[PDB]
Amino acid sequence: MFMINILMLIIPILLAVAFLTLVERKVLGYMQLRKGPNVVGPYGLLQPIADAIKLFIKEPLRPATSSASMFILAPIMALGLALTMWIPLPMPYPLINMNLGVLFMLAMSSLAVYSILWSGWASNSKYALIGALRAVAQTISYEVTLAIILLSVLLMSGSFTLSTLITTQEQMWLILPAWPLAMMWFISTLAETNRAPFDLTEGESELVSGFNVEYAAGPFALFFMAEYANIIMMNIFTAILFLGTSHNPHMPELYTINFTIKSLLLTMSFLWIRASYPRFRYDQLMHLLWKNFLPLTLALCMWHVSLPILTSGIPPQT
């Protein structure tokens, strides 16, 4: 009954990712005064299936100069780690209930970076290498700010357990006492997922396709699936972190409905932002985080350390 539970998690994720690509193409279409897919299936509903089948019957390529083992390893890590990020999510019950779910996701997200570094490096081509080193730059920009932003929020929750964030937000969303952190967190998730305006490791208009320019067919699809699975997961995490849904233990489906709507809307906002802004220069991303978010995050970290003590609002360990 646990293996069935695992399949009830990852198969829907791959279906949600498939239809997220359709929803992105439609939403950007209408914001761009056009329609987007509406021929392949009614309202384009069969488009993701056609794209999936086409890629997996397309010829994969191993570049002559590439490092074979790392070339193939890199897409497997990308999808493997993207799905691993979902096992601790309380929806409202996690598949795996971790004491330190917040830190587990931080560690896995750091490991998922290497699927970019090694794919770009193993490709042994210049555009792939340039994209890979942008990933190094991008991680340096957001990782320090991201962890300290989380720490400030967890000082009101009192735990690293993701399920405790549900209990913390039983009377009120944490976005009220921490909207300055929610703002910087929301930006950090765009940088963390290589999403526009921080889509730099791929950066179509500068690097052709960046770190995965040499990938084709199925191996390319794994990277694309991993990206969109990370988009949804990070918006679920944002919803749990700042827009806590009340949980009724006798009607857990009602949590899952309200919780899903919030995550969809947050994911829709990622598409909305992509349609609205130009791309950052990747040294301007580093300065944004280090010169703006970091000084403010450090100050808010001290503030949220002190605030529970001075207001006598320290949460419990459980």
């Binding site: 193409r25 005064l33 897919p37 069969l46 390529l61 179509e204 320019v213 040499e214 990938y215 067919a217």
Partner: protein
């Protein structure tokens, strides 16, 4: 036997023609009408046609403009770097047969001296709608492929 491979062709053909990704590759004037096919009035994306810059992630090459001798080795290169199956659409008189520079010392008299061409779209330039007619004609060519039926009868 025949019935299963017959349906399987219909499936792989349907997927390939419903998900056609042209290389982001334009040469001259005709690339402007290629832009207008991506623009709202015609919205190529609604047919499942999506530009992708990398040759590795492209199914179709639309040769949109004049091919010079200096450019010819580069065009052949990115064509060779597409994974298969791959298709070439020749757009406009210059690509089709040299056109108005046909007698120039620096122009390739038709891109079909360099790559195989599936569809020839006439015009100088073809209207955006005429190119869309060519793309849909390429789709109907792919709908008629018999890869598995022929394999089964080998």
């Amino acid at each position: 036997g025949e019935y299963v491979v017959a349906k399987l062709d219909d499936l792989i053909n349907w997927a390939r023609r419903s998900s056609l990704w042209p290389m982001t590759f334009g040469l001259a004037c005709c690339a402007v009408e290629m832009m207008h096919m991506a623009a709202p009035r015609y919205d190529m994306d609604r047919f499942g046609v999506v530009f992708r810059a990398s040759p590795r992630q492209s199914d179709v090459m639309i040769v949109a403009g004049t091919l010079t001798n200096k450019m010819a080795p580069a065009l052949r290169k990115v064509y060779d770097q597409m994974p298969e199956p791959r298709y070439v659409v020749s757009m406009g008189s210059c690509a089709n047969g040299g056109g108005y520079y046909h007698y120039s010392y620096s122009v390739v008299r038709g891109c079909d001296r360099i790559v195989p061409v599936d569809i020839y779209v006439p015009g100088c330039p073809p209207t955006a709608e005429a190119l869309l007619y060519g793309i849909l004609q390429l789709q109907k060519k792919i709908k008629r492929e018999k890869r598995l039926r022929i394999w089964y009868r080998r």
